[PDB]
Specification:
DNA-binding; repeat; TATA-Binding Protein; 2 domains; DNA binding; elongated; transcription regulation; 10-stranded antiparallel β-sheet; alpha+beta; 10 strands
Length: 187
Amino acid sequence: VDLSKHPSGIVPTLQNIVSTVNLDCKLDLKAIALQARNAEYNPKRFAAVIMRIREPKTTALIFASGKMVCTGAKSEDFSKMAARKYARIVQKLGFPAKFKDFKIQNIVGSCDVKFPIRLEGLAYSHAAFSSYEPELFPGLIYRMKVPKIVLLIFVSGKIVITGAKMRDETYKAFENIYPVLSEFRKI
DNA sequence: GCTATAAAAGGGCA
DNA sequence: TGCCCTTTTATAGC
């Protein structure tokens, strides 16, 4: 790892990317669910056609408005690439589908600092950013202000970082928390 | 399973 | 007017 961009020497692994795009045309969801083999639509439950492709492994929520949500990709490039594949399937179904305002909405990453954490203590010292009700959920919820990112910290040293729109925020949030985790290493 | 976290889309309903 | 709901993903105890 490049110790220069990642001083901790640990790089969060990207696990999930959520993006949206505007197909810029009205869609008939019922016609889509009927023609598209790997598409499901239950309006009484959710007003979107749920469609999935194997590569990049992702799930799309396609709306009558032409707007679309792409989930599951492991990278921003994979997410865009997936979003484009769905837009082409919709095109080939007979709709004038474009690709307007593609935007990465959320990036989820995770890593392991490989040492256990004293969550109770970190929670106490960082109360204005922490929520820890172990009887509820075993992880401590750390709502970082700069960058405005949320981290789920576990006793095992495993960390989840979410809420970023740019991978650098994921990286910086982790670099910010790293000395703090060290400060609260369980001995 | 399911507790919790982020985020987007849009229909239903209080 | 504005929350829930659906989907995804890592994490870990119920």
